[PDB]
């Protein structure tokens, strides 16, 4: 019943906890659907109350509100923009310093979904000061929080060259290069994901990846037994090889040609074609 959504939004002002939790679950439920469902939640006026609940001292209420905002931020760019225009970003950035790992994880989920939108939505994340907090979380001992910070930084690095350069200017490259030494393979995969998105920009952004010293580690990861890590390193290297001759020359000087020509005989047909295309990009001019 469409009449239930305004009543659900009305229950967001309820002094009772279980009424509040029930309405937040329904909103989080509806926002689990398509954009049409998320649009009905927004049109019911749920965003202003949801943003206010980000200041709740109750741990369970803050988690349910973050999960509802997270799911709404998984919609279209204009629905992500409604989340931005409702004022959610300053609270999410503040929540990036919370000692509660459950709260911090959910705040990272919402920020990552917002950063999954267009360049206008990614720039709002940048302008709210999310980057230096995200870069700081790359030093977290929690492997789960570390993955969430990599997911958020990768989505920000999925925008235009201006958004990619903001990630570089925030000092994310030295932490990403060091994460290539991680024995944890799912963290190592997310770091390659972020580096590949950064290396997909212009020659300035590609040279910044080279200047951070990422090439020796990327070349070594071409010998990884994990074919997912092997491919991600191959994708990151081929993005770097797409740059100018100075960029291709650094890839060759890192010894990538020997491994790339070997990977043409790899047992995976997909890897063979990517190694072949990387060698094509390495032809100068």
């Amino acid at each position: 019943p469409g009449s239930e959504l305004p009543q659900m939004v009305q229950q967001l002002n309820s002094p009772d906890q279980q009424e509040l939790q029930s309405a937040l679950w329904k909103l989080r439920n509806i926002a689990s659907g398509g954009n049409e469902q998320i649009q009905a939640v927004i049109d019911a006026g749920a965003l202003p109350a949801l943003v206010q609940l980000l200041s709740s001292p109750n741990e369970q209420i803050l988690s349910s509100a973050l999960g509802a905002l997270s799911n709404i931020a998984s919609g279209g760019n204009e629905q992500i923009q409604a989340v931005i225009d409702a004022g959610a970003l300053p609270a999410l950035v503040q929540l990036l310093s919370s000692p509660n790992e459950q709260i911090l994880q959910l705040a990272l989920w919402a920020l990552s979904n917002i950063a999954s939108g267009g360049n206008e939505q990614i720039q709002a994340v940048i302008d709210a000061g999310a980057l230096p907090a995200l870069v700081q979380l790359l030093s977290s001992p929690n492997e789960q929080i570390l993955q969430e910070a990599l997911w958020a930084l990768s989505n920000i690095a999925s925008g235009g060259n201006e958004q990619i350069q903001a990630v570089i200017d925030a000092g994310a490259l030295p932490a990403l290069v060091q994460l290539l030494s991680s024995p944890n393979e799912q963290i190592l995969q997310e770091a390659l994901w972020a580096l590949s998105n950064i290396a997909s920009g212009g020659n300035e952004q590609i040279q910044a990846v080279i200047d951070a010293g990422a090439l020796p580690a990327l070349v070594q990861l071409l010998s990884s037994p994990n074919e997912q890590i092997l491919q991600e390193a191959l994708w990151a290297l081929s993005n770097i090889a797409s740059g100018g001759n100075e960029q291709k020359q650094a890839v060759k000087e890192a010894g990538a040609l020997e491994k790339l020509e070997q990977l043409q005989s790899h047992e995976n047909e997909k890897i063979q074609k990517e190694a072949q295309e990387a060698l094509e990009k390495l032809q100068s001019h």
Partner: peptide
């Protein structure tokens, strides 16, 4: 490689 975005929905 292209630039890859990732959205996630919660089930709880």
């Amino acid at each position: 490689k292209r630039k890859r975005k990732r959205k996630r929905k919660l089930s709880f």
